[PDB]
C-alpha cells in the first residue's frame, strides 16, 4: 500500500551478538507510559511557574530525541545519564518563547496585540527580575519608545506593526536572555532529573517482573544485515485481546486500549512474519503490538507529517529503489518504513518487526541508503559524524541519499557539513514535506520545510562507481513527485 516489503536488503554488516534489552513487556510500558505523563506535567508547571509560558509545542518530543543521542542509561526512552546535563535542544525552544510566545499573525490587530503583549511582557520581567542595569535601561526604553508609538493617534498598517515586533525582538532578545539563562537551565537540569528517577522505578520493576518469571539476565563473518535479536529470553505472554471497529484495530491489555488502523496492522503482521523468530505460533504477536503502539504512543502523543519528521511519497521510494539500489532506511520505524529493513530508535520492541536498532549504532560496509531523520538538529550532527565515518571506513560500495529541510536561517551545523563533505557527489532540491495520507479517518509542518528539501548525495569512489547521480537517473527521481 505505502511499502514494498518485498525489496531484500544490500545492506552488509559483521554478525553482532544479540542485546540485552529487558523484552518488552505491556505491565512495563503502561508504567513508561503514566510516568512520562506525569514528566510532561512536571514540565508544564515549571514553565509555568518560572517563566509564566505554556511548554513550546513539540519541545518536550524534540528533548526526548536530543537527549537519545547522548543518552548512555537504561531505559529506551526516557533519559538518565547523560552529557551535558541541560539540553541546548529544550533550553533554545524554551528561551525563543520568552518573554511570550510568538503566534501566527494574519491581521492587523492580531499584530497590533502581540507588539503590545511582547513590549508589556518584558517590563513585567525588568520589573519583577534580577538584571543588570545596562540591560533595564535598553529594555525600558525600547519598551517605552514602542508603548508612546501605539499611542499615536495615527495608526499604521500591519507590516508596519509585524516590523515594528521583528525590531523590537531584535533589540530586547539578549537582554531578556541574560535575564532569563540560569531560570531556563534549571528546567532543564530538573525535568532531566526527575527523569533519571523514573528510569530507576522502570527499571527496578522490569527486574523484579522477570524474576517472577524465572527469566536470567561471536566472529564477524560480513553478511547481510538481519533484524536486532534479544539475548533475553521472552517472558510468558500476557492476554491481550483484539477486535476490530470499523477499519481500526483495537488491543486491549487489562482494559487499557491502543488503536491503530487495519492496514498498518496487516502490514506488522507482515513485518513480523519477515523478522521474528521467536514466536511461531504467533503466542507473543499481540503482546508485542500492544507494545510497539504503546510506545510511539507515548513517543510521539499518538499514532501524517509533524513538527518532528516528514513523510517521502511512496513513488519517490521507488524511484530510489530503481534508480539507485536503495533498500534500506537509516530512520524509520515499523509503523512507517517503506523497506521491512530500517534503522529505529526502539530495537527492544522494534527489532520483532524488522528494525536494525537506532542508526548511530549501525555499520554497514555495503549497501545503498535513504535518510530523512527527524527534525533534530543534535540529531542530524550526529548523523553526518557516523555518514563520514562509514564511507572513509569501507571501501565497498557505499551510498547515502539525505533528505532534509533546505533551511538557511540559519543552517543547521549539519547542513553545513555535509554540503563541504569530501563524499557529496550531488546536492538537489525538492519539494517542501507536505502531509502525506494514510490514515484513512494532526500537526502542521515544521516551519523549517516550508521553502524545500535538500537532497544530497553522500557516496566513496565504490558507491559513486555503481549508483552514480546521472542526469538520467536524477530526471527519474524527479519525476516521481506527483
Same mark, same amino acid.
Given at each position: 500500500v505505502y511499502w514494498d516489503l518485498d525489496i531484500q536488503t544490500n545492506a552488509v554488516i559483521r554478525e553482532r551478538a544479540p542485546a540485552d534489552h529487558l523484552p518488552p513487556h505491556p505491565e512495563i510500558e503502561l508504567q513508561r507510559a503514566q510516568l512520562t505523563t506525569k514528566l510532561r506535567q512536571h514540565y508544564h508547571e515549571l514553565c509555568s511557574q518560572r517563566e509564566g509560558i505554556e511548554p513550546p509545542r513539540e519541545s518536550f518530543n524534540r528533548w526526548l530525541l536530543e537527549r537519545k543521542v547522548v543518552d548512555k542509561g537504561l531505559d529506551p526512552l526516557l533519559p538518565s545519564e547523560c552529557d551535558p546535563v541541560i539540553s541546548p535542544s529544550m533550553f533554545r525552544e524554551i528561551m525563543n518563547d520568552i518573554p511570550i510566545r510568538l503566534s501566527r499573525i494574519k491581521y492587523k490587530e492580531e499584530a497590533r496585540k502581540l507588539l503590545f503583549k511582547y513590549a508589556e511582557a518584558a517590563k513585567k520581567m525588568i520589573d519583577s527580575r534580577n538584571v543588570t542595569p545596562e540591560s533595564r535601561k535598553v529594555v525600558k526604553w525600547n519598551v517605552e519608545d514602542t508603548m508612546n508609538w501605539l499611542r499615536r493617534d495615527h495608526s499604521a498598517s500591519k507590516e508596519d506593526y509585524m516590523d515594528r515586533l521583528e525590531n523590537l525582538r531584535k533589540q530586547c532578545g539578549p537582554h531578556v536572555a541574560s535575564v532569563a539563562k540560569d531560570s531556563v537551565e534549571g528546567i532543564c537540569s530538573k525535568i532531566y532529573h526527575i527523569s533519571a528517577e523514573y528510569v530507576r522505578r522502570i527499571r527496578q520493576a522490569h527486574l523484579t517482573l522477570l524474576k517472577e518469571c524465572n527469566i536470567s539476565v561471536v566472529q564477524d563473518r560480513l553478511v547481510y544485515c538481519y533484524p536486532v535479536r534479544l539475548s533475553i529470553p521472552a517472558p510468558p505472554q500476557t492476554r491481550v485481546e483484539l477486535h476490530f471497529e470499523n477499519d481500526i484495530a483495537c488491543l486491549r491489555f487489562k482494559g487499557e486500549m491502543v488503536k491503530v488502523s487495519r492496514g498498518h496492522f496487516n502490514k506488522l503482521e507482515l513485518l513480523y512474519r519477515y523478522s521474528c523468530i521467536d514466536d511461531p505460533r504467533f503466542e507473543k504477536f499481540l503482546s508485542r503490538v500492544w507494545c510497539l503502539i504503546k510506545r510511539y504512543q507515548v513517543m510521539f502523543g499518538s499514532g501524517e507529517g509533524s513538527g518532528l519528521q516528514g513523510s517521502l511519497p511512496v513513488?519517490?521510494?521507488? =524511484?530510489?529503489?530503481?534508480? !539507485?539500489?536503495?533498500? !534500506?532506511?537509516? !530512520? =524509520?520505524? *515499523?509503523?512507517?518504513?517503506? +523497506?521491512?529493513? !530500517?534503522?529505529? =530508535?526502539? *530495537?527492544?520492541?522494534? /527489532? +520483532?518487526? /524488522?528494525?536494525? /536498532?537506532?542508526?548511530?549504532?549501525?555499520?554497514?560496509?555495503? /549497501?545503498?541508503?535513504? =535518510?530523512?531523520?527527524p527534525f533534530c538538529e543534535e540529531l542530524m550532527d550526529a548523523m553526518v559524524t557516523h555518514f563520514e565515518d562509514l564511507l572513509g571506513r569501507s571501501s565497498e560500495p557505499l551510498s547515502f541519499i539525505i533528505f532534509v529541510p533546505e533551511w538557511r536561517d540559519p543552517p543547521t551545523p549539519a547542513l553545513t557539513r555535509m554540503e563541504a563533505s569530501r563524499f557529496r557527489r550531488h546536492q538537489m532540491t525538492v519539494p517542501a514535506f507536505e502531509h502525506e495520507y494514510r490514515s484513512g479517518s494532526r500537526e502542521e509542518i515544521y516551519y523549517k520545510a516550508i521553502h524545500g528539501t535538500a537532497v544530497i548525495f553522500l557516496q566513496n569512489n565504490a558507491g559513486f562507481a555503481k549508483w552514480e547521480p546521472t542526469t538520467e537517473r536524477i530526471q527519474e527521481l524527479l519525476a516521481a513527485y506527483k
Open positions: 513513488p519517490v521510494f521507488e =524511484a530510489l529503489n530503481k534508480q !539507485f539500489g536503495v533498500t !534500506f532506511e537509516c !530512520f =524509520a520505524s *515499523p509503523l512507517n518504513c517503506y +523497506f521491512k529493513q !530500517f534503522c529505529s =530508535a526502539f *530495537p527492544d520492541i522494534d /527489532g +520483532f518487526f /524488522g528494525s536494525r /536498532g537506532p542508526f548511530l549504532s549501525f555499520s554497514p560496509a555495503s /549497501g545503498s541508503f535513504e =535518510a530523512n531523520p
